[PDB]
């Protein structure tokens, strides 16, 4: 299904389950799509929820609009989906870049009384280095990623999931070509332009302010061996800044743990949601 | 192209060939799409037919609707496509789950005087074991498939075509990465929920009644080494229940024979159809 | 986005950049899509251009219409895109089959005064061997490709990019699975019938008349180790037929040079366009 945003973007989304069942809205990471949530969507459907997941603008099946690739637009696009379906008050779950999107959404759209939120290996508070965040990674790494997206996206989208994303580069770890390919697939159908700007969006946006204002219960799930988003600089700090945040640490887990450790993550996610 | 069903589902379809040429409507298997018919579509176009192939609900490019994943809905979706294109009286060819769809369609929509039908490695009469079908497979096997679709669909959709589907697991057979990849691709663009429910639809639906009522000529094709749909409990029985049915057995052929043995299957399909 | 043609075909296209910026329209090769221009689109966006790229009928995301798979229709489809977006007078860049499409467009749609054009490893003047073109390739070669598309498309679409297309079959050249898979991917989402007929369209259409009539500045780029479109019977001859055309030779370069040698191809395209 599709919804047209205020600025004319076509946002694709999946909406499964009873119309009146409690809702969980899932927000995917960079440079993926709603297809990255298969395991979670089926698990929560089987546990009584209506599940919704949309493709970020320029990602997956959503329109490849060339501009507006920043957290504020991402958040407003979320607002469009929510209002379109009338799913205000839903629980919002965000992975990686999607976690930033969730936080920014809960910050600029308080009119939507979101029940609870879950940040899984999310980018907040900030990934880039600034005088306020000296622990932020150097742009050179991000600028480099943008160069890869611009000059060899097809291979770069193989390298990321085949190496650091799922921890398949660790010793004794058996890689899954299906999982690698699906990551790659979701990336290739998206816009190179949206993904290019998207790196600035998830790496150079400061969510410190937003985290401090969120009063709802928020669970932060982070693997201590996350090679893409810093466990301490992002996860631990995020849980600390959130007034009602709680941290859930997973030893040795990778960035893509919701896929490679679906059972564990889903069970813990459900426990938190049911309070 | 798309047709909107009575219940609001968008069904994607392909329609190639002269508008007034005789029609062959192809029905794909689980968990694929109309793209799985490439070889047949071009073969029959070259042999004077108009060919139509649609994506089952929640499969390929069709709407990822969360419910209605059963044979009755699959059949009514076919009716929508047929009515939209005005292709009543066509020949219908179904592969695997698609074979069950063809049978249910003919049964629920007798108004459409289908000319003939071909069931290839099709699921009828009933795949699962029950008190009425002692020779079927235990439900646990299908529950296992559902579990795979629910927790590791991306790899599972590699395992099936790389192993049992095309017989590539048979020592000595040369696998095709392109064919494996295309199977996987069609599966991944479809809905995990549609595929999850779809397993129950194809393995636990009894088509005995539908088969007994089909009076048109029907050809049942089946490889005797089908690792996906047991030859003895499907093709053999379906052919006998069909009043005007006939069985065509292919020794050593896999479930996906229409793809790996296109020349032979296309030639035999044509002989029966034309 | 999409535009509906006169004959009811849905043509998918990408349109990126400031609405008021100078336009460059890219035309992809067989059996690909607009996604094949990733590297070029981002490079020109960075240089202040508005870039447009559409999927040929029956290719990529465009309608899998069963007929009209010939150069005249491809050209009329271009006309529909141009009129829809109001991008008359833009620069047109076509690769391989796309090169033929550009030339046919500029010929049957003179009302649009295209500024300049670039033909990269383009099919003109005529690929197949005929009495008038004794230096062409025997038709049997193209009949072979058609048979592969009809009975072994999934694997054939792996073989072409893994072998001759990018020169990965040359000694000492390392292949990119991501690039091979992306070529394969774009081909599989397109129509087998459109691709089957498309072989006749690109290999047996004579563009001599069109070429002799184009007065605009045109740059003909061609690698001399192109295993898909013979250098000597294409680019060399096309450059001479064009009243204001010039040949740019890339020694040892493959057919898919815009992808494997993006830095060089982009720089030369930019220099020519602003010349």
Q: Greatest CA span in chain C, whole angstroms?
A: 49
Does A151 sit within 8 Å of C16, measured CB to CB?
no
The number of helix segments (H) and strand segments (E) in chain A equals 11, 8
- From chain B, pick out residues whose CB is under 8 angstroms from the CB of C154: 38, 176, 178-179, 181-182
Q: Of residues A62, A96, A203, A238, which has the active-site annotation?
A: A96
**CATH T-level topology, domain A1-275:** Rossmann fold (3.40.50)
Considering only the beta carbons, identify the residue of A14, A42, A262 that sits closest to B64.
A14
Distance CA C115, CA C92 (A): 8
Compare CB distances from B262 to C149, C151, C181 and report the shortest one's residue: C151
C64: nearest CB among B14, B46, B262: B14
H or E stretch at B2: strand B2-4
List the domain boundaries for chain B: 1-274
B1 → chain C, closest CA residue: C63
Give residue B48's region: left, alpha or beta (phi > 0; psi -120 to 50).
Answer: left
Tokens found for residue C160: 């072409």
SS3 at position B249: strand
* β partners of residue A4: A10
Maximum distance among all alpha carbons in chain A? 49
Q: Is B183 on the interface with A (CB under 8 A)?
A: no
User: What is the Cβ-side half-sphere exposure of residue B20, based on CA atoms within 13 angstroms?
Assistant: 0
Report residue A213 as tokens. Answer: 């204002």
Q: What is the DSSP string of A37-103?
A: GHHHHHHHHTTT-EEEEEPPTTSTTS---SS--SHHHHHHHHHHHHHHHT-TT-EEEEETHHHHHHH
How many other CB atoms are there within 10 angstroms of residue A128's CB atom?
18
Mutate to test the interface with A, among C181, C184, C186, C262 (most CBs of A within 10 A): C181
Contact A150 C179 (CB under 8 A): no
In sequence order, what are the beta bridge partners of A10? A4
Which residue of A155, A190, A197 is the best one to mutate when testing the C interface, meaning the one whose CB has the most C CBs within 10 A? A155
The SS3 assignment for B138 reads coil
- DSSP output for A95-153: ETHHHHHHHHHHHH-TTS----EEEES---S--B--SS-TTSBPHHHHHHHHHHHHH-H
* Binary contact (B42, C193; C-beta < 8 A): yes
Catalytic residue among C62, C63, C96, C191: C96
Q: Give the separation between CA C144 and CA C142, rounded to whole angstroms.
A: 5
Find out if CATH 3.40.50.1820 is the number for domain B1-274. yes
Task: Kindly list the residues from chain C whose CB atom is less than 8 angstroms away from the CB atom of residue A151.
Answer: 39, 262-263
Which residue is it, tokens 């097809």?
A154
Flag if B42 and C191 touch (Cβ within 8 Å).
no
**Cβ neighbours of residue A140 closer than 8 Å, sequence gap 6 or more:** none
User: How far is the CA of A229 from the CAs of A60, A156, A254, B64, B114, in angstroms?
Assistant: 22, 18, 9, 32, 58
Is residue A100 within 8 Å of residue A125, measured between CB atoms? no
Structure tokens at C252: 């040892």
Q: List, in sequence order, every residue forming a beta bridge with C246; answer none if it has no partner.
A: C219
Cβ pair A94, A117 in contact under 8 A: yes
Q: Which of C12, C13, C15, C16 to mutate to test the interface with A (most CBs of A within 10 A)?
A: C16
Chain C residues within 8 A of B46 when measuring between CB atoms: 150
Interface with chain B: mutation pick from A33, A182, A183, A190, highest number of B CBs within 10 Å: A182
Taking residue B143's Cβ as centre, other Cβ atoms within 10 Å add up to: 12
C6 at interface of B, judged by CB pairs closer than 8 A: no
Element (H, E) at B54: strand B50-54
- C14 and chain A: CB distance < 8 Å anywhere? yes
Q: Which letter does DSSP use for residue B12 in this model?
A: E
In SS3 terms, chain C reads as CEEECCCCCEEEEEEECCCCCCEEEEECCCCCCHHHHHHHHHHHHHCCCEEEEECCCCCCCCCCCCCCCCHHHHHHHHHHHHHHHCCCCCEEEEECHHHHHHHHHHHHCCCCCCCCEEEECCCCCCCECCCCCCCCECHHHHHHHHHHHHHCHHHHHHHHHHCCCCCCCCCCCCCCHHHHHHHHHHHHHCCHHHHHHHHHHHHCCCCHHHHHHCCCCEEEEEECCCCCCCCCCCHHHHHHHCCCEEEEEECCCCCCHHHHCHHHHHHHHHHHHCC
Determine, for residues C150 and B43 on separate chains, whether the beta-carbon distance falls below 8 Å: yes
With a CB-CB cutoff of 8 Å, which residues 26-85 of chain B face chain C?
35, 38-39, 41-43, 45-46
| Pairing verdict, β B50-54 and B10-16 | antiparallel
Contact B242, B271 (CB under 8 A): no
Round to whole Å and give the CA distance between A78 and A9.
12
**Which chains have 3 or more CB–CB distances shorter than 8 Å to chain C?**
A, B
Q: Tell me if C42 and A185 make a contact (CB, 8 A cut-off).
A: no
**C-alpha distances in angstroms, A181 versus A50, B219, B259, C159?**
28, 38, 23, 19
How many A×C Cβ pairs under 8 Å?
A: 55
CB-nearest partner of B193 from A1, A45, A181: A45
Give the pair of three-digit tokens for residue B13.
């379809």
Do C228 and C258 form a contact (C-beta atoms < 8 A)?
no
CA dihedral B206→B212→B218→B222, nearest 10 degrees, is 40
Among residues A82, A120, A66, A147, the alpha carbon closest in space to that of A248 is found at A120
Residue owning tokens 């009514």: B76
CB spacing of A14 vs B150 below 8 angstroms: no
Please name which of B81, A10, B249 lies closest in space to residue A1, comparing C-alpha atoms: A10
Burial of C94 (0-12, 13-18, 19+ CB in 10 A): buried
Q: In what order do the strands lie in the sheet with C91-95?
A: C2-4, C10-16, C50-54, C23-27, C91-95, C117-120, C218-223, C245-250
Q: State the sign of the Cα–Cα–Cα–Cα dihedral A39, A41, A45, A48.
A: positive
* Yes or no, beta carbons of C156 and B176 under 8 Å apart: no
Q: Which helix (H) or strand (E) holds B189?
A: helix B177-189
Q: HSE on the CB side for A257, CA within 13 Å?
A: 31
Rg (CA), chain B: 17
User: Phi and psi (nearest 5°) for C12?
Assistant: -85, 145
User: Of all helices (H) and strands (E), which one includes residue A246?
Assistant: strand A245-250
Task: Tell me which residue of B28, B97, B20, B40 sits closest to B270, measured CA to CA.
Answer: B40
The full DSSP string for B190-238 is S-HHHHHHHHHHHHS---HHHHHH--S-EEEEEETT-SSS-TTTTHHHH
φ, ψ of residue B27 in degrees (nearest 5): -120, 115
CA A179 to chain centre: 17
> Using an 8 Å Cβ cutoff, are A255 and A223 in contact?
yes
Instruction: Select the residue of C14, C38, C46 nearest A153 (Cβ to Cβ).
Output: C38
Q: For residue B105, what are its two tokens?
A: 């369609």
* Rounded alpha-carbon distances, angstroms, from residue A108 to A26, A72, A113, B43: 18, 8, 12, 57
Distance from CA of B62 to the nearest CA of A (A): 10
Closest CA to B143 of B129, B155, B158: B129
Q: Half-sphere exposure (CA, 13 Å, Cβ side) for A40?
A: 31
CA distance A221 to A258: 10
* Chain B partners (3+ C-beta pairs within 8 A): A, C
Contact C49, C24 (CB under 8 A): yes
Count Cβ atoms below 10 Å from residue B18 Cβ, excluding itself: 12
Asked if C62 is an active-site residue, the reply is no
């Amino acid at each position: 299904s599709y919804v047209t945003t205020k600025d004319g973007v076509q946002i694709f989304y999946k909406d499964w389950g009873p119309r009146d069942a409690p809702v969980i809205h899932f927000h995917h990471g960079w440079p993926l799509s709603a297809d990255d949530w298969d395991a979670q969507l089926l698990f929560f459907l089987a546990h009584g929820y209506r599940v919704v997941a949309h493709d970020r603008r320029g990602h997956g099946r959503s329109s490849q609009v060339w501009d507006g690739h920043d957290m504020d637009h991402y958040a407003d696009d979320v607002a469009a989906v929510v209002a379109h379906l009338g799913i205000q008050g839903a629980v919002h779950v965000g992975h990686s870049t999607g976690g930033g999107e969730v936080v920014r959404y809960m910050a600029r759209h308080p009119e939507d009384k979101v029940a609870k939120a879950v940040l899984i290996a999310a980018v907040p508070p900030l990934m880039v280095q600034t005088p306020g965040n000296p622990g932020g990674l150097p742009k050179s790494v991000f600028d480099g990623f943008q160069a890869q997206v611009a000059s060899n996206r097809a291979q770069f989208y193989r390298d990321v999931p085949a190496g650091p994303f799922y921890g398949y580069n660790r010793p004794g770890v058996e890689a899954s070509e299906g999982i690698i390919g699906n990551w790659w697939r979701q990336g290739m159908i998206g816009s190179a332009k949206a993904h290019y700007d998207g790196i600035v969006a998830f790496s150079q946006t400061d969510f410190t302010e937003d985290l401090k204002g969120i009063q709802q219960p928020v669970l932060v799930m982070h693997g201590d061996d996350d090679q893409i988003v810093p466990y301490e600089n992002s996860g631990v700090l995020s849980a600390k800044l959130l007034p009602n945040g709680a941290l859930k640490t997973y030893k040795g887990y990778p960035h893509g743990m919701p896929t490679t450790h679906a059972d564990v993550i889903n069970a813990d996610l459900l426990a938190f949601i049911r309070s």
